[PDB]
């Protein structure tokens, strides 16, 4: 049976790999072997790591992380007799893991391959990681035809590229199968607002807080759920502005299951998160991006996402249009699924693996 | 404050091709070269990391270089890092530089065999370095073309040529070779060991018997199985000197004196034609096909009849000799390449 290495270090990697892992378990042709470089999410999907290297820490030098992964991942890959190594996305784990696999002459498959902003070292190091992984990988699981196109421009052979789609829709269905969050949202149009980036802290958060106030004052039927940042100085702003409004629930940081349950119930999503810009349109949610740029420009091009920055007049206007113009809402909802790839992607990865090996 | 240019290498061939760029960066008042090593020209290393060893795991080498090169690059306030060729140093160094947001320039960029993981890890290294580098010093138009196929912007690619010709210009086997036409024969590859080395040994014997005026110098590999064959066949021949591995200065001096070169070395397939030496390649394939196309090299395998024939033609037909000598020297790129690298650096930064 083909022994398939699954290497990740972070929650977003684990979420996108889980449906491939589960499908590799179920199919008798393959044996998945999970090695981590970075637990809640392991328990939620039923992922049982065989090795936990414990490399990654907060505020560790990129060079230190890469060095430990490049130095230490080979031995467990060899001990577990791994035939192929799968890495995911644009992470420094995925790059360092792929180089480690290539040093032992172990073929690499890449889940979610071919995404390009066309903006060198923006973001850093995600953009260079993508291009390095693309040179190391024998097999490329592209989420869309456009992604596949980008791999060809970088010298990848057509026979190595499969349009597999995106596993994230399958991972979110798996967690779709709570106290007041259900009571607060039921019967109402609810906005999910996640705002967490460091450049968003202080003044911009206040500007977004004022927009929420305005919308709540104009639209009595409208509700907002706003997860508060775990840093007391940061969560101070939203409390000082919004705690007295009955139409606004300020909650503690959410676990993944509660979070995507809430996102599924919401009518639209306001976020500065690259992850949420992908997840929300995949569940059919129009996204306003609380930034003047994005790491996911595909959503802007397809029209399932819209840059709104932290301008309160624009946020009010843009939220209004979507609540009042069912045409406007659909023109963001329709392109949203299929923008980041079709679902049932795990099965398409297995076919490509069964064909090559 | 001059533009501080990091020069990172671990091996002799890197150091050889970088030396003329280093010397030119020294001379020019707009730049300051800073040599960091990972493993005769007047190269002054500022930091020597004794990372590399014989028979060390690639993953161990890459890990130490990726982990340890950043700090010295930052301490020495390096603005740009230059790496050379297809080495694991050049790749690991480039990633280390990129982690500290230091731009990378690549000397001898764009060579592609079109044969994935052959050789390993040189072929993947080339493609990784190409993604990391901001500036590409391609030795030829064809190399530049290969960088575009992998998504490199035309603005970042300069046809600089090849520094190796400039680097090369910088007793008992003297007695043996003086006044005679001397053939240099270097043979090391594993697939060549045993029977094929005997076939090459027999060709040398035949040529020596037919041409009493002809001489051969054959540096012996440190592998006893290689020394055994050559000894059994060639130790009794007066016209054949079997010597120990040569120092680089004596080796290039010998190659300059030689009338032609027989080799299974990719390095020598480049160096010999660059000094105007016709090359017979002791292989059925090559990682330097440009030399075959230009006609300064010829595949001869280990076929004794062909070796005899091919050596004969060149020794007897001075027209045939020139038709292999001329297309060398600028087959692997034009010279004066260091100056072209400086121009490209001064243009971008
Ligand atoms: Na299985
Ligand atoms: Na200088």
TrEMBL record, chain A:
Organism superkingdom:
Bacteria
A Pfam family reported for this protein in Swiss-Prot or TrEMBL: Epimerase_2
Which Gene3D superfamilies does the entry link to?
Answer: Glycogen Phosphorylase B
Is this entry keyworded Isomerase?
yes
Q: What does the entry list as the binding residues for UDP? A: 11, 196, 254, 259, 273-275, 279
Please tell me which top-level EC class this enzyme sits in: isomerase
SUPFAM superfamilies (UniProt xref): UDP-Glycosyltransferase/glycogen phosphorylase
Coiled-coil regions listed: none
* Entries under InterPro entries matching the protein: UDP_GlcNAc_Epimerase_2_dom, WecB-like
EC number from the UniProt entry? 5.1.3.14
Q: Which residues form the UDP-N-acetylglucosamine 2-epimerase domain?
A: 23-353
Record-annotated residues binding UDP-alpha-D-glucose?
Answer: 11, 16, 88, 90, 112, 130, 196-197, 254, 259, 273-275, 279, 295-296
Q: Which UniProt keywords apply?
A: Isomerase, Nucleotide-binding
A single MF term (Gene Ontology): UDP-N-acetylglucosamine 2-epimerase activity
The record's listing under PANTHER family reads:
UDP-N-ACETYLGLUCOSAMINE 2-EPIMERASE
Q: Family, per the entry?
A: Belongs to the UDP-N-acetylglucosamine 2-epimerase family.
Matching NCBIfam families, A to Z? Answer: wecB
Annotated protein name in UniProt? UDP-N-acetylglucosamine 2-epimerase (non-hydrolyzing)
């Amino acid at each position: 049976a083909l022994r398939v290495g699954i290497v990740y270090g972070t929650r977003p990697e684990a979420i996108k790999l889980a449906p491939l892992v589960l499908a590799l378990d179920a199919d008798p042709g393959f044996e998945p072997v999970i090695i981590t470089t970075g637990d809640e999410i392991n328990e939620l999907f039923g992922l049982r790591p065989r090795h936990n290297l414990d490399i990654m820490r907060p505020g560790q030098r990129l060079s230190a992380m890469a060095s430990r992964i490049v130095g230490e991942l080979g031995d467990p890959l060899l001990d577990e007799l791994v035939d192929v190594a799968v890495v995911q996305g644009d992470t420094s784990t995925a790059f360092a893991a792929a180089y480690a696999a290539a040093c032992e002459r172990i073929p690499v498959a890449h889940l979610e391959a071919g995404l390009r902003t066309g903006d060198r070292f923006e973001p850093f190091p995600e953009e260079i990681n993508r291009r390095l992984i693309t040179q190391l990988a024998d097999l490329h699981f592209a989420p869309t035809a456009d992604a596949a196109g980008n791999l060809l421009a970088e010298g990848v052979r057509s026979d190595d590229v499969y349009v597999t789609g995106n596993t994230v829709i399958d991972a979110m269905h798996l967690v779709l199968d709570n106290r007041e969050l259900d009571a607060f949202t039921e019967g109402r149009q609810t906005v999910l607002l996640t705002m967490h980036r460091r450049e968003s802290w202080g003044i911009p958060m206040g500007r977004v807080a004022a927009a929420v106030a305005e919308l709540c004052r104009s639209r009595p039927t409208l509700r907002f759920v706003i997860p508060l940042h775990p840093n007391p100085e940061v969560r101070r702003v939203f409390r000082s502005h919004l705690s007295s409004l009955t139409q606004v629930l300020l909650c503690e940081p959410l676990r993944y299951s509660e979070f995507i349950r809430l996102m599924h119930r919401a009518v639209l999503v306001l976020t500065d998160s690259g992850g949420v810009q992908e997840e929300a349109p995949t569940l059919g949610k129009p996204v306003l991006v609380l930034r003047d740029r994005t790491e996911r420009p595909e959503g802007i091009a397809a029209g399932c996402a819209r840059l709104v920055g932290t301008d309160p007049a624009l946020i009010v206007k843009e939220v209004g249009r979507l609540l009042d113009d069912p045409e406007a809402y659909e023109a963001m909802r329709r392109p949203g699924i299929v923008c980041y790839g079709e679902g049932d992607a795990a099965a398409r990865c297995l076919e490509a693996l069964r064909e090559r090996w």
